[PDB]
Design a protein around this ligand. Structure first.
Ligand SMILES: [Zn+2]
Ligand SMILES: [Zn+2]
Ligand SMILES: [Zn+2]
Ligand SMILES: [Zn+2]
Lengths: 362, 362
C-alpha cells in the first residue's frame, strides 16, 4: 500500500548550469529531484557566471526551460555592485540570496553596510535568503530588524544557531529557517569514515550535541532543504576540496526513515517539504501533481545514487526505510522505480505562471 | 595662558597587573595616565589571572588600591563559566566586559548563546562593554535587542562599524561607542613605517577611508578612550607579536592638536573624555580635580614616552601642539611638567565612594 504525498519542494539546490556542468546540469539535477520525490526546485545563483544581473538571469532562465525535468524558480544573487539594480527583474526570481560567509569573489560582500543596502533596495514583498553561520545569523537578523523586514536563514547546523533563531521567534521577529539532511543524519562521528575531503561541507558537520539540538528543536525548523551541492569525487578527494554534498536523491528516504521510527510525523515532514516552502517563497501549487512512496521497503544507500553527476554520496552505507515509487507532474508520469520518464525541457519557470507571481500593493 | 579642563576619564586601559607587570603595572600605568591629563581610569580584566570571579576581583582591588596614583574602577570579564555567578560583586565593578573576537582561553566565548546568558544574568542597571569587530558589532547589537538592554561598543575602527552604529542610533537603539586615537591618527599608510610587528593592533589599523569616516561621523562617537595596551618592544618586534599600542601619554596631545586645527571643538573633546564617560559608566565626580594644558607648545613625539613601561610608541615622529602642564587630583598636585608627585596608592576605587555606586530600584 503506497502513500500519496503532494509534490514536494526543495528551496535550496545548486544545479551548476551554467558553468559547472560536469558536476551537474539542469537535466541531471532535476532527474535527481524527481527520483527523490521533489517536483519543484529553487536553484541557487552561484553558477559561472553567477546570476547577479539581468543578462545572466535571462541566460539561466533559457537553460533551465530547456533542461529542467521538474518545475523551478531561479534565485538572484547579491553582489557588491548590484544593490539598487535588480528592481525590474526581481519579481521574476525565486528571491535574493546573500552569501555572508565564504563565497566566490563575485558574491562576496565585504561590509555589513552592503547587506543593509540590499535589504533596503530589494523589493520589500520579495524573499531574501542568507547563508549565515554562527554569529553571522545574529548579525543578519540585526540588519533585518534595522530595515524592518523578514529574512530566511539557510541550512541551520548548530545548537547555537537554532537557539538564537528560537529566541528571535519568541520575540516575534520575522525569521524563518531551514535545515539540511546531512545536519540531521550525520555528525563529527562520521568524519572518520568520510575523510577530510568528502567530509568538507559548509556549514560543517556538527557535533552529536548539535544534531540532537536540531531534533529537539524541530518546532523551530520551518523547512527542510537539501543544499544539493554536487561536486565530483575527483574534486572532493583532491587537494582543494570544495564544500558540499549531493542530496536530492537521499533526502526523502532519510526523512521517511525518521518518520517510520516516530522521530517526527508525516505531517511534520509535509509542513517542512511542501506547505512552508510554498508560503515562505510564495510558490504556486502544481496541478495534478503527486508522489507515491513505499514506507515498508528497507534498503541500504549505495556508493552513488543513479542520477546526480556527483556520482558519490556521504550517506553511503546508511540503512533507510522508505522509497519513492512514482511521481506524477502536471498529469504526466515523471518517474517510476528508477526510471525518469519526462524529457529535459518538461519543467517550467513557476514565476511565469499567473498564480506564481508574488502579490504586491500597486 | 593655560586652559583649565576637568579631570579626564579613560574608560579603556590595560594596566597588566596582576601577571604582566613587566609590560606595565598600576603604579606605572597611572603615572602615564596623569601625564596624559587623565585622572580616572577603568582597567580591563584580561590580566593573569583574568578578573572573572570574586577572588580575582578582590586581589585586583587591593593591588590597585596599593599601586594606583589616580582614581580607578575595575572591570569584570565574561567567561564561558561565570554567567549567573557575579551578582554579589557586580555593583563593585566598572561593568562587565565581553571579548567577542580574539582572546585568551579564559575569556573566550564559543557561542552567541553564551553572550545572551551574560546579557540575561548581569544586573540590568550595570554597564556591559563588548570588544566587537565588523559583523560582530551587528551580532552583539542583536543580542542586546533580544535581551532589551544597552551595550557599549569598544574601539570602533572602520567605516562599516561607525555606519552600522549610526543606523542603530537612528532607530533609537540604546548603543554607545568609543574610538581610540590610533584609529583617528594612524592608518594603513603608516604600516610601512611601523612594520608588521609594531603595527599589530586589534582592531587593526584602518584605511584612509576608514579614518576619514570616523572623523566625518564624530557625532556618532560617544567617547574617546586609549585602549592603552602596553607590550614591550621585545614583544612587539618578536615572532609572535601581541596586538596593542600604549596610548595614555599621547592621547590628549594628539586630540588637542586636532582641536587647534579646528577638526573638533574643545567642547567636543570634553564631551568625549569627561561627560559621556561619566554618564555611560555612572562614574562619580572628583572633587578639587583639574588639568591645566598649554595649547601653544609644539613638540615632536619621541621614540618612547617617559612613564609607560611599554617603552615605545606608534606615534613616534608625529608633530603635536598641546601639552599637559599640571594635574591636581582631589586637592593635591599630582603632575607638573614631566614629574609625577603623588605616590603609588594615592588612587582610590571610585565604586566604593557613596556617589560612585550605580543607582538601582530596590
Ligand atoms: Zn549556503
Ligand atoms: Zn547552498
Ligand atoms: Zn578590545
Ligand atoms: Zn582593550
Amino acid at each position: 500500500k503506497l502513500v500519496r504525498l503532494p509534490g514536494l519542494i526543495d528551496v535550496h539546490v545548486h544545479l551548476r548550469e551554467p558553468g559547472g556542468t560536469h558536476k551537474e546540469d539542469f537535466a541531471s539535477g532535476t532527474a535527481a529531484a524527481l527520483a527523490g520525490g521533489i517536483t519543484m526546485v529553487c536553484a541557487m545563483p552561484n553558477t559561472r557566471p553567477p546570476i547577479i544581473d539581468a543578462p545572466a538571469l535571462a541566460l539561466a532562465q533559457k537553460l533551465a526551460e530547456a533542461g529542467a525535468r521538474c518545475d523551478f524558480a531561479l534565485f538572484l544573487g547579491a553582489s557588491s555592485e548590484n544593490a539598487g539594480t535588480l528592481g525590474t527583474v526581481a519579481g521574476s526570481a525565486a528571491g535574493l540570496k546573500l552569501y555572508l560567509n565564504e563565497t566566490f569573489s563575485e558574491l562576496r560582500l565585504d561590509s555589513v553596510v552592503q547587506w543593509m543596502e540590499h535589504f533596503e533596495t530589494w523589493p520589500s514583498h520579495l524573499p531574501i535568503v542568507a547563508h549565515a553561520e554562527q554569529q553571522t545569523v545574529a548579525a543578519v537578523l540585526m540588519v533585518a530588524q534595522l530595515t524592518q523586514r523578514s529574512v530566511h536563514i539557510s541550512h541551520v547546523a548548530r545548537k547555537e544557531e537554532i537557539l538564537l533563531i528560537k529566541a528571535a521567534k519568541a520575540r516575534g521577529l520575522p525569521v524563518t529557517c531551514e535545515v539540511a539532511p546531512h545536519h540531521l543524519f550525520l555528525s563529527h562521528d562520521d568524519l572518520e569514515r568520510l575523510g577530510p575531503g568528502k567530509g568538507e561541507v559548509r556549514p560543517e558537520l556538527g557535533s552529536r550535541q548539535d544534531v540532537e539540538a536540531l531534533w529537539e528543536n524541530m518546532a523551530v525548523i520551518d523547512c527542510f532543504a537539501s543544499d544539493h551541492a554536487p561536486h565530483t569525487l575527483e574534486e572532493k578527494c583532491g587537494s582543494r576540496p570544495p564544500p558540499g554534498f549531493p542530496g536530492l536523491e537521499t533526502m526523502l528516504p532519510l526523512l521517511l526513515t525518521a518518520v517510520s521510527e516516530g522521530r517526527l510525523s508525516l505531517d511534520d515532514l509535509l509542513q517542512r517539504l511542501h506547505h512552508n516552502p510554498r508560503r515562505i517563497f510564495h510558490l504556486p501549487p502544481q496541478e495534478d501533481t503527486y508522489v507515491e512512496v513505499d514506507l515498508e521497503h528497507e534498503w541500504t544507500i549505495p556508493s552513488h545514487m543513479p542520477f546526480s553527476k556527483a556520482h558519490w554520496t556521504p550517506f553511503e552505507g546508511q540503512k533507510v526505510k522508505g522509497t519513492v515509487r512514482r511521481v506524477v507532474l502536471r498529469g504526466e508520469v515523471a518517474y517510476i522505480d528508477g526510471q525518469v520518464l519526462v524529457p529535459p525541457g518538461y519543467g517550467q519557470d513557476v514565476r511565469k505562471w499567473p498564480q506564481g507571481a508574488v502579490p504586491q500593493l500597486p
